Amino acid sequence: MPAYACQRPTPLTHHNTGLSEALEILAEAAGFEGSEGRLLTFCRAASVLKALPSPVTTLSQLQGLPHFGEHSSRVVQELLEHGVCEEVERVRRSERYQTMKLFTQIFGVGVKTADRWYREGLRTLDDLREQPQKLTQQQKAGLQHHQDLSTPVLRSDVDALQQVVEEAVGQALPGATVTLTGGFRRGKLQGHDVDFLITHPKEGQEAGLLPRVMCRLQDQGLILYHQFERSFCIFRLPQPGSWKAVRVDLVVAPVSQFPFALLGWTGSKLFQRELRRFSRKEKGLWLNSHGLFDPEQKTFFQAASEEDIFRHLGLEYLPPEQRNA
DNA sequence: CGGCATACG
DNA sequence: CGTA
DNA sequence: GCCG
Ligand SMILES: [Mn+2]
Ligand SMILES: [Mn+2]
Ligand SMILES: [Mn+2]
Ligand SMILES: [Mn+2]
Ligand SMILES: [Mn+2]
Ligand code: NA
Incomplete structure (x- = not known):
């Protein structure tokens, strides 16, 4: 089992749900105390369990797994032996x-x-x-x-929202495209928000697009809140005989950057942090949602697809539904 | 021990 | 500071 | 909290 989450498939559903949820409680609590290092370790340990092919039944099975030391192993051992981890429960009710x-x-x-x-x-x-x-x-x-x-936002909500965004995007710039990203692209059936990535096949035509899209959505009465290339909005979504507020993120990228933005906005968050960590520490390349930089030659890799980016980094390709780290 | 991802609003 |  |  490799040490970075971007080196292994992680499916949305798996065989160690209870164990991973417990570790993620401790990760979240570490974050609340400002301990980003402990948060990362607990997140990574949880993700290792998500990638296993069968349930952990005995402490023996943690031997050799990356990111399992005394603390995360004790958490698992207590869950296996008593069905409860006193530390986790203490956090939950605090x-x-x-x-x-x-x-x-x-x-x-x-x-x-x-x-x-x-x-x-x-x-x-x-x-x-x-x-x-x-x-x-x-x-x-x-x-x-x-x-x-x-x-929760449902997948049924998403398709209605995408048609609405496409209509505004098409008036703002004929030929511009809208791609669903975030957790729904990874196969989630529900979400806290909807994420869309917008581009145009002619490099440079996307400049100035997001204000034009927002103005048109606002004129249609769909924007409950907005505050450039990223917009974090609250949309008014129709419902039977009424409506509900939904968080929507709108992002624009030039077609040259689109594979990097697609990769970054598709997540998961831990997958992307691990991918960027791997890039820098193992390959000496700097990755973000705009591109991939070789700081020795001072050049940017050109990518036409996510597949290109994985190849650049020496990683086997993972489809979005296996990036649920 | 140092490192822990890397942007934009 | 917030957001992804 | 864990890794190299
Ligand atoms: Mn400890
Ligand atoms: Mn999302
Ligand atoms: Mn979002
Ligand atoms: Mn930019
Ligand atoms: Mn230290
Ligand atoms: Na918040």
Whole structure:
């Protein structure tokens, strides 16, 4: 089992769901305390279990697995022996974890803001609503729409949204294309948001496109919130006899960059961090959602496909549905 | 021990 | 600071 | 927290 998540297929569903979910609780809690290193290790350990071909039944089976040391192994051993890990359960019911999770899931609130509010004695959403001047426009939108934004987006919602975005994109720039990315491209049946990548086959024609798209969506009454090449919006999505707010991310890239943007925006987040880590540390190349740079020759790799990028990096190709690290 | 991904709004 |  |  290789040490980087981008070196192994990781399917959306797998054979160690309970074990991986426990480790991901500890990863999330490490993040809430600002320990990005411990977050990464717990995330990586969880992802290793997602990539295994069958269930872990005995501690023996962790021998040799990357990212399993004394701590993550003890977590698994307790789950295998008692069905519960005392540390995980202690985190789950802690006031700190519950409140940081509630606050950080608000659009516009990150760990640093949530932590400051926590230290001020704040604990509930109504606590935040009671002092609106302590809030950005983005946070006000996140809190007004919080209930809708907490309900999963379904694949049925996605196709309706894509037709709407395509209509606005086609008026903004005939010939421009809209590609579904994010978790839905990896096969997820639900999501917290919808992600779209927009390009045009003639290099340079995409310049200035996103403002034109947003104006047209706004004129159609579809934009509940917006604040360039990336737009983080809240869309008004029709529902039987009403509607609901949905988070939508719109991204524009020139066709030269489109494979890199597609790769980055398709995720998963851990897969992309691992891919960039692998690129730099094992291949000496610098990867982002714009391109792949050789800092010794000071040149950018040209890619026409995701397949090109995996080949450049010496990695076997993984389709999106196997990037669920 | 140092490193831990890398951008834009 | 937020966002992906 | 783990790896090299
Ligand atoms: Mn420990
Ligand atoms: Mn998404
Ligand atoms: Mn998104
Ligand atoms: Mn750019
Ligand atoms: Mn150290
Ligand atoms: Na947030």
